[PDB]
Amino acid sequence: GPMSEAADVERVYAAMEEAAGLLGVACARDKIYPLLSTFQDTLVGSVVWFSMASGRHSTELDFSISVPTSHGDPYATVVEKGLFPATGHPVDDLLADTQKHLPVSMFAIDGEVTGGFKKTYAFFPTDNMPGVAELSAIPSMPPAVAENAELFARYGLDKVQMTSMDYKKRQVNLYFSELSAQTLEAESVLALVRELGLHVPNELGLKFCKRSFSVYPTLNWETGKIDRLCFAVISNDPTLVPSSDEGDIEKFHNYATKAPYAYVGEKRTLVYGLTLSPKEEYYKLGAPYHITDVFRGLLKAFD
């Protein structure tokens, strides 16, 4: 009934507050709830995903929520609903431009619990992933994508599994998948990082990157220079944070084992990130709250 479905939104929000509390973070209800209501119809085949990002000097909590393509472009929805002001910049058009040029299998919206909406995702079918050539066939894609196609191809980064768009920072992430083990070999990783002028991982980091199922750079429309790069590892293990700092080791194992999960039996699947930027490295841990059987098979495929 109607009360149930509004209670669902309230339940996602209590799970978001529960997850934030594990980091000492305070959610801003007035910034989150309107976004959840606007998309309440999807919440009651919903994928809801709480991802932590922590480094030395910063720690943040994002929430992500799937939106079927049949629902229409969800960034257009949030602009029409007045939930985010259209930056007046090509990133406004990029999610719709992608659907217009490529088979998108699903969208997702993404917020940060203190500022609200900031980010959308565009997923592609696993049996029909595009490469760098198709992705720069999209007019509102940044020039940087084509300008780095030599580099991507030289490192064997071809098939892209999804993209994401950050409207606050005006950036894009290309989530490369189907990585050859040679790309993830330590010497390959070190060359790539040093060509992009980013923080060099140590031996721990490199053993992490060897485990990656996806690699993703961040690009922008101002320059062809990749802003940062992330190596993503998928695993059931709550201990894989590529850090030797006992605080980190504790923080991430705590989140991994305590983040809310709508399921009573399953050992939840985790997605770790090692992000290298020009000035630092930091670590990400995403944890599903509600998942679909489809998304379960998706995460199964990655192992």
Q: Please give the structure tokens belonging to residue 98.
A: 């992608």
24 Cβ contact partners less than 8 Å away, ≥ 6 residues apart: 59
Q: Is 81 left (phi over 0), alpha (psi -120 to 50) or beta?
A: alpha
Residue 13 vs residues 9, 60, 161, 252: alpha-carbon distances, Å: 6, 16, 29, 21
Breaks in the chain after residues (C–N exceeding 2.5 Å): 44
Q: Please give the structure tokens belonging to residue 206.
A: 């490199």
Residue 244, Cβ neighbours under 10 Å: how many?
A: 10
Contact 241, 264 (CB under 8 A): no
The single residue listed with the structure tokens 């259209």 is 86
Residue 203 vs residues 34, 123, 188, 225: alpha-carbon distances, Å: 44, 32, 13, 26
What one-character DSSP code corresponds to residue 26? -
Specify the amino acid at residue 14. Answer: A
Nearest Cα neighbor of 60 from 48, 52, 71 is: 52
Resolution in A: 2.5
Q: Please give the structure tokens belonging to residue 271.
A: 């997605």
The single residue listed with the structure tokens 């760098």 is 132
- The reply to whether 62 sits in an annotated binding site is yes
Residue 201, Cβ neighbours under 10 Å: how many?
A: 20
Is 167 in a helix, a strand, or coil?
A: coil
